[PDB]
Design a binder for this molecule. Structure first.
Ligand SMILES: [Zn+2]
Ligand SMILES: [Zn+2]
Ligand SMILES: [Zn+2]
Ligand SMILES: [Zn+2]
Lengths: 50, 51, 117, 64, 1130, 137, 50
RNA sequence: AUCGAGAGGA
């Protein structure tokens, strides 16, 4: 991306469906979001269990 | 207070070598330095050495 | 108002600190290290811009026009030279974080004019 | 940085106490055992290690 | 000339193929180890100081040159023979080579009576050797030659064999050195703190860190520097004064490059005022010398201490020689300058997670850290041994002085245990380095060899280091990461990612002084204003006037394979006028296609030469030499404008960029080894791709071709591995086609009888009868008979009931005379495979036989006998157990869809199509919608097309030539419903199912997790010695833990007797006798019925108390602490 | 809570020996308006001047006049710290606090700092931000 | 949705965009883009549902 | 057998 690109593509809007398939940038941004979910799931457990 | 043997079991090992427990080793340390200190305080010993 | 710069002694090259001469009632700039003195031409000793009305154009440098990652535009020609293309970018600095204001730089070599719409 | 120092005169460990009189810009180091005393100028950046330093330096200089 | 779009999709993959023909997948491991052996050991040996020892005569003992021979093994006789890696695996040897060092010891006593004695090739130690490295016996061998040594040609190497165990070094993340990083801690006494972990390039010493901080909020900012070996902070201006820059102007010349800037100036001012008291170098050196050496030191020595710290200890990368203080002053002023820009907000705080800021510590540099420590310790011992002889005045023999066990045993221990450090400092050492190589399946081995690790600590609950940073793109797999407690901390290399091995900067520096560069001691600071700084490996070396054509020249040198090697990073920050050049090791980078004006440099001539790569020896490395490809590191990507595909270069109605500099070879190379297996991963939810990347490593297959000769502790081999019908173009390089880990199964996604609900599957019993997902489980048992001393000796021999004491009731008839079972003998649980008897001090020998791990029921596959390193008998027995899939075995597709077998139906019970095709597996439709694994469905449809067409489907992630419509149109040409649905008939009744079921071929995986290895039960088994409670584990016949949360649940239930049963009756019932007066456990003698408390001197008031044994143990351990827990029964 | 920094545009210290002939040219009107009338002796006044430029709109946002600010200054520091100021009509909202009875150029900075940060013109301390809205729920 | 986000991006670039109460200009732009794109996602979801 | 470490599973 160009510098200072606040457009939807650049900042992680996946304009495709799962049937259409994600583009490589959409794939990476989606992996980032899913990683957030995985970290939350793996980090909340200790602190909720305590 | 020395605890009994059940608090610090000497577990036997695949052969005959009887491994002692951490408490037993530590009581060994306390005993050796206690005996050694005892003979120093009984005898003439430097106040800083006794300390 | 404008800021005030540090000035140095001319004997030991250490900074001159302010002080006041009561028997001329005039500002002086004297060195604590040696015993040099100067008469001020400012009369202002300290300036704080809480608002920070900084012209970020001064912080830009023309060399940024060489950046392949910056966006370029043909819609804002240069007022200096008439070059047709120009790079643009945002403020991206502390106290410029507010306001997405675009700054433009001419891509003509040796012109390097900078401006803002 | 330790505040109690071995005295260069009587070699008694941690027998030297340092007093920083900042209002007069003077540090006074005194041995409790042999009662040797030394006074040096100090600055706001100075520390008891610096006063003991000036004392050791004064001793070595005077002993030349 | 130009590659057109219609050809691109194979031009690119041709390029990718060439890369993997040149490099492979474990290139980073081999290159790191090669650099370590070629350089790092010699550098470490030469960087050690000569040990000058004298009483008189004196000796220096230079070390000057190293020789690492081939790995050899010495027998008891001692004849050296070349030891082959498979022999090391079988005999539990360490695949190591001897390191010899030339030593020069010159006698100097008096009167110019000098004479040198050189000991050529003094055996200094043994270095374990990475397999397939340059110094490995498998180096350069053909596939013939490897097979003919019993080695798998597909084995990547990249690991060590220590004591027969395959150990893999995990790359360790660390925060890059010699770079200034400004951060701001929200909760601290500093608004801003800049640091540099300076480290001299040649690893003479560990990195020394300097901090230049900003005191928290006259009350103006105050800047202090935390120098090494100096007890207390120091104001920066006194550090500058200590470098001889006394005038306040001279100091600011180094700190502030433009005096016209008021705002910098006013910020610095408090520090000038704070150091106003000290005005001259000797007082500054005094002031610094006071903090550090001793409370009482003579002034001359204090000054010498402060000098020594400043030129050596502070900023070693700038320089350690004398008369460098101008360099030091400029770099220190640059650090302060950076702090000021961060404090003023002109420049952003550095990011800890940017991989431009991080370095990967690979096998080479890690072994260098060990070798540095161990060679230091060895030299210390040489000094001591020589010293006692010189004290007595007698001559000392150097061979006797050198105890080679330090290098040998240190490297062996640290690679064997993973505790990275000295064996004595077993708690300060950091574990997890050097793990046991995963040999479950080939993908697990590759991934483990490409594994990276972020040592933040799993206990840390801050998500920031665990987040997938933007800068991981192309360097680290976005998907492959453990989903447990280490999520995002353990990472994996992307496929074309290459970690730089390190290089010498001297060619670059020499070239820079040709060109328009000016040294830093040679300039006046006034020039630094509009000039551009030049850093090399962190080190501000000079300035330049036209950075643009400098960058053009340097880039075009590196693209020519001139003095600048390919792995050298060259970043031009334009807004700030720095040019940062990096040659060090640990920089992760990746190859990219260079772009002309708007045009790939890669023309059709390159693709043509690459097509005949096997004839004209035109390889990848010529592609790099042609200036068509470039390795770009994370930090240089910040200055790069990437085209995702050459279609981005194409002039558009509205041009996005129009100034691209590089292009992706293929975006699918952002994935790693295990994620490159997933078909259509861009049609799945990303957590599903992560779960598959984890589960592909538990999938069965053929983990290695030479499995028949390996005596692995555990091994699973699938009977009938199949290559997937639907594959990605990356698997051609993972060798998945050659060692696949699954079977193409006819999957129907249906609700059939309810036995596949909630992540479960219904398998075809008939297919399982035909060998579907059948596997063989190999388990190896070790044993050795130790003759450690005449007191007691073990020996393999068929025990006898009359001489052996600890003989179990199990029969030993399956053993032979030699005490070893024979191959082909069927063995059930608790059977004996090795009859070992140990001589006593049921007489004169006790049974210590090896039994099978209980409840296995295999057949002895083979028995190997040899001698271990010390050389007693050593036996390995591999037992073989056929695992037929059954209810409870875990299976998975390549899309995170895991599930156990719920039930198995025969072919007549399964639903069938009009042409009598029954599914091999039926999975529940409810596993799809929440999971959004549309890649599973697209793979099923593509696989139906592929099987009907005679293809292998292309499921490469980002491929616009393959979408669902075009697959459906293809499938409708073979007489099938275009969406993959079919009319099925109920197997039980033969009626059509009202819903048409989605059925087709999908690649499934059988995972290591079989129910027969998990089922466990206990009823009054063995107990633990300390607390008389059930053991832990299936293997120990242990009990299940009724934990605190089960106690809490049963308290909520109100089930007090059940709670007492679980926590008292079923765990550790016990009785004690308590004195009624003092409540302390008394002495009971139930045989003679005499009961007394020595404390109270009573023998009539004693009570029986029924308590848990753990509670009696607790109360006794509390008396051990002088606590009196008195059980008052009244 | 609103401190003087939140409503201040820029502060500066001058050396003004005379109030009658000020260093700055645009502040000469109201200063000579203040001084001829001897409510507050010229001799008492110190050479060192503190000039603070308030921005108009921040004053209006809290509906704050220089009168309230000057009252708060003269209350926090008593008569020890004289303050003067023009009307709320000039294009620049300015007020001058030169001291009137570690050197005064340093002292006046400590005063300036302490004024800008911890002098409370309005509101309740440790209530930083407030948002008014209509609850839809 | 993209072409609306472009509209908003030019307004912000030309200083045609004024903050809303309780937010900085960055945060208002981010709100305004996120609420364009959530409207897009909801509307496309509705279309798929129907 | 004990201790530690590591890798995994839910
Ligand atoms: Zn001076
Ligand atoms: Zn121009
Ligand atoms: Zn004394
Ligand atoms: Zn009793």
């Amino acid at each position: 991306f160009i510098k200072d690109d606040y457009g939807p593509e650049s900042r992680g809007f996946v304009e495709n469906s799962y049937l259409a398939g994600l583009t490589p940038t959409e794939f990476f941004f989606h992996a980032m979001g899913g990683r957030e979910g995985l970290i939350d799931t793996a980090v909340k457990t200790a602190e909720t269990g305590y | 207070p020395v605890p009994p043997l059940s608090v610090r079991p000497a577990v036997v090992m695949q052969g005959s070598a009887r491994n002692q427990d951490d408490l037993t080793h530590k009581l060994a340390d306390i005993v050796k330095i206690n005996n050694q200190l005892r003979r120093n305080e009984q005898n003439g010993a430097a106040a800083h050495v006794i300390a | 108002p404008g800021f005030v710069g540090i000035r140095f002694c001319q004997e030991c090259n250490n900074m001159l600190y302010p002080k006041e001469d009561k028997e001329n009632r005039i500002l002086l700039y004297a060195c604590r290290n040696c015993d040099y003195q100067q008469e001020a031409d400012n009369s202002c000793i300290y300036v704080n811009k809480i608002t920070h009305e900084v012209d970020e154009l001064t912080q830009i440098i023309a060399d940024v026009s060489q950046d392949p990652t910056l966006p370029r535009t043909e819609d804002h020609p240069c007022q200096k030279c008439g070059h047709k293309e120009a790079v643009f970018f945002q403020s991206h600095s502390a106290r410029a974080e507010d306001a997405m204001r675009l700054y433009y730089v001419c891509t003509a070599p040796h012109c390097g004019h900078r401006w803002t719409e | 940085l330790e505040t109690q120092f071995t005295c260069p005169f009587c070699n008694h460990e941690k027998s030297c106490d340092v007093k920083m009189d900042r209002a007069r810009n003077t540090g006074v180091i005194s041995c409790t055992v042999c009662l040797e005393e030394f006074q040096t100028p100090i600055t706001y950046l100075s520390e008891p290690v610096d006063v003991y330093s000036d004392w050791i330096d004064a001793c070595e200089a005077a002993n030349q | 000339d130009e590659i057109t779009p219609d050809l691109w999709q194979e031009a690119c993959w041709i390029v990718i193929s060439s890369y993997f023909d040149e490099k492979g997948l474990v290139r980073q491991q081999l290159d790191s180890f090669d650099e370590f052996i070629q350089m790092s050991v010699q550098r470490i040996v030469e960087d050690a100081p000569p040990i000058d020892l004298q009483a008189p005569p004196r000796y220096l003992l230079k070390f000057e040159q190293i020789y690492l021979s081939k790995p050899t093994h010495w027998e008891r006789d001692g004849a050296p023979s070349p030891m082959m890696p498979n022999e090391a695996r079988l005999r539990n040897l360490t695949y190591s080579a001897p390191l010899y060092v030339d030593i020069t010891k010159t006698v100097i006593k008096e009167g110019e009576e000098q004479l040198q004695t050189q000991h050529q090739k003094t055996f200094i130690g043994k270095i374990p050797i990475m397999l397939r490295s340059t110094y490995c016996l498998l180096n350069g061998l053909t596939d013939r030659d490897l097979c003919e040594l019993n080695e798998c040609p597909l084995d990547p190497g990249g690991y060590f064999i220590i004591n027969g165990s395959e150990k893999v070094l995990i790359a360790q993340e660390k925060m890059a050195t010699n770079t200034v990083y400004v951060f701001a801690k929200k909760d601290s006494k500093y608004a801003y703190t800049g640091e540099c972990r300076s480290c001299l390039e040649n690893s003479s010493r560990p990195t020394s860190t300097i901090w230049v901080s900003m005191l928290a909020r006259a009350i103006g900012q105050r800047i202090v520097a935390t120098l090494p070996y100096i007890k207390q902070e120091v104001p920066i201006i006194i550090v500058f004064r200590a470098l001889g820059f006394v005038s306040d102007r001279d100091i600011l010349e180094h700190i502030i490059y433009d005096f016209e800037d008021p705002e910098m100036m006013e910020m610095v001012k408090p520090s000038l005022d704070e150091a106003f008291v000290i005005q001259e170098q000797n007082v500054a050196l005094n002031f610094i010398g006071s903090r550090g050496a001793k409370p009482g030191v003579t002034k001359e020595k204090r000054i010498k201490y402060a000098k020594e710290v400043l030129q050596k200890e502070m900023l070693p990368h700038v320089g350690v020689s004398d008369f460098c203080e101008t360099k030091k002053a400029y770099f220190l002023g640059y650090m302060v300058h950076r702090l000021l820009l961060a404090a003023l907000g002109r420049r952003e705080l550095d990011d800890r997670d940017h991989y431009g800021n991080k370095r990967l510590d690979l096998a080479g540099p890690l072994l260098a850290f060990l070798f540095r420590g161990m060679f230091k310790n060895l030299l210390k011992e040489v000094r001591i041994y020589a010293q006692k002889f010189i004290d007595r005045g007698k001559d000392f023999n150097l061979e006797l002085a050198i105890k080679t066990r330090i290098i040998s045993d240190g490297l062996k221990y640290s690679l064997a245990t993973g505790n990275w450090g000295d064996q004595k400092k077993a708690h300060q050492a950091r574990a997890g380095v050097s793990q046991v190589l995963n040999r479950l399946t080939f993908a697990s081995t590759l991934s483990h060899l490409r594994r990276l690790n972020s040592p933040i600590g799993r206990d840390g609950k801050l998500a920031k280091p665990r987040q997938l940073h933007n800068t991981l793109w192309g360097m680290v797999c976005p998907a492959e990461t453990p989903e447990g407690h280490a999520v995002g901390l353990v990472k994996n290399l992307a496929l074309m990612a290459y970690i730089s091995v390190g290089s010498q900067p001297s060619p670059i520096l020499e070239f820079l002084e040709e060109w328009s560069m000016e040294n830093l001691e040679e300039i006046s600071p006034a020039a630094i204003a509009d000039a551009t700084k030049i850093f090399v490996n962190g080190c501000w070396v000079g300035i330049h006037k036209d950075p643009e054509q400098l960058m053009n020249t340097l880039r075009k040198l590196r693209r020519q394979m001139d003095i600048i090697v390919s792995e050298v990073s060259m970043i031009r920050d334009i807004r700030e006028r720095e040019i940062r050049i990096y040659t060090d090791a640990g920089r992760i980078c990746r190859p990219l296609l260079i772009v002309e004006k708007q045009k790939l440099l890669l023309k059709k001539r390159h693709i043509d030469q690459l097509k005949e790569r096997e004839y004209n020896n035109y390889s990848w490395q010529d592609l790099v030499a042609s200036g068509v490809v470039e390795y770009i590191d994370t930090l240089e990507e910040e200055t790069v404008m990437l085209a995702m595909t050459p279609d981005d270069l194409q002039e558009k109605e509205v041009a996005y960029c129009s100034t691209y500099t590089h292009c992706e070879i293929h975006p699918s190379m952002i994935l790693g080894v295990c994620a490159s297996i997933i078909p259509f991963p861009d049609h799945n939810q990303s957590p599903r791709n992560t779960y598959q990347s984890a589960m592909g490593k538990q999938a069965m297959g053929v983990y290695i071709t030479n499995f028949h000769v390996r005596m692995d502790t555990l091994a699973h081999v699938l009977y009938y591995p199949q290559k997937p019908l639907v594959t990605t173009r990356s698997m051609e390089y993972l060798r998945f086609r050659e060692l696949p880990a699954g079977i193409n199964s006819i999957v129907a996604i249906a609700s059939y009888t309810g036995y596949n609900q909630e992540d479960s599957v219904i398998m075809n019993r008939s297919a399982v009868d035909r060998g579907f997902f059948r596997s063989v489980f190999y388990r190896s048992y070790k044993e050795q008979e130790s003759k450690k001393g005449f007191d007691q000796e073990e020996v393999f021999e068929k025990p006898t009931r009359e001489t052996c004491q600890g003989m179990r009731h199990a029969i030993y008839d399956k053993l032979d005379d030699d005490g070893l079972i024979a191959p082909g003998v069927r063995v059930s649980g608790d059977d004996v495979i090795i009859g070992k008897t140990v001589t006593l001090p049921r007489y004169t020998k006790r049974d210590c036989s090896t039994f099978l791990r209980t409840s296995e029921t295999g057949i002895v596959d083979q028995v190997m006998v040899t001698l271990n390193q010390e050389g007693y008998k050593f036996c390995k027995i591999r037992v073989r157990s056929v695992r037929i899939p059954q209810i409870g075995d875990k299976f998975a597709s390549r899309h995170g869809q895991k599930g156990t077998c719920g039930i198995q139906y025969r072919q007549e019970d399964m639903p069938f199509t009009c042409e009598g095709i029954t599914p091999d597996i039926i999975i529940n439709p409810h596993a799809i919608p929440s999971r959004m694994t549309i890649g599973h469905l697209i793979e099923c449809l593509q696989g139906k097309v592929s099987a009907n067409k005679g293809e292998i489907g292309d499921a490469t992630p980002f491929n616009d030539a393959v979408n669902v419509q075009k697959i459906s149109n293809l499938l409708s040409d073979y007489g099938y419903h275009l969406r993959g649905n079919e009319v099925l008939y109920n197997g039980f009744t033969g009626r059509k199912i009202t819903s048409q079921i989605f059925i087709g071929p999908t690649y499934y995986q059988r995972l290591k997790h079989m129910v027969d290895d998990k089922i466990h039960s206990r009823a009054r088994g063995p107990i633990q010695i300390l607390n008389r409670q059930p053991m832990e584990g299936r293997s120990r016949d242990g009990g299940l833990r009724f934990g605190e949360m089960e106690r809490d649940c049963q308290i909520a239930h109100g089930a007090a007797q059940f709670l007492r049963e679980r926590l008292f009756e079923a765990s550790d019932p016990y009785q004690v006798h308590v004195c009624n007066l003092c409540g302390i456990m008394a002495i009971a003698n139930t045989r003679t019925h005499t009961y007394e408390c020595r404390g109270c001197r009573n023998k009539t008031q004693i009570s029986l108390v029924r308590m848990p044994y753990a509670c009696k143990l607790l109360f006794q351990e509390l008396m051990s602490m002088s606590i009196a827990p008195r059980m008052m029964s009244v | 809570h609103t401190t003087l920094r939140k409503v201040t545009a820029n502060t500066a210290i001058y050396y003004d020996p005379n109030p009658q002939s000020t260093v700055v040219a645009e502040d000469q009107e109201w200063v000579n308006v203040y001084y001829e009338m001897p409510d507050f002796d010229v001799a008492r006044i110190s050479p060192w001047l503190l000039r603070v430029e308030l921005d108009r709109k921040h004053m209006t946002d809290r509906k704050l006049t220089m009168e309230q600010i000057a009252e708060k200054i003269n209350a926090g520091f008593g008569d020890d710290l004289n303050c003067i100021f023009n009307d709320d009509n000039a294009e620049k909202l300015v007020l001058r606090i030169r001291i009137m009875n570690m050197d005064d150029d340093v002292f006046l900075r400590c005063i300036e700092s302490n004024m800008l940060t911890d002098m409370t013109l309005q509101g309740i301390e440790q209530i930083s931000k407030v948002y008014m809205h209509l609850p839809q729920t | 949705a993209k072409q609306d986000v472009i509209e908003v991006i030019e307004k912000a670039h030309n200083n045609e965009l004024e903050p809303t109460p309780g937010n900085t200009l960055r945060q208002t732009f981010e709100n305004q883009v996120n609420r364009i794109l959530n409207d897009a996602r909801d509307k496309t979801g509705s279309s798929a549902q129907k």
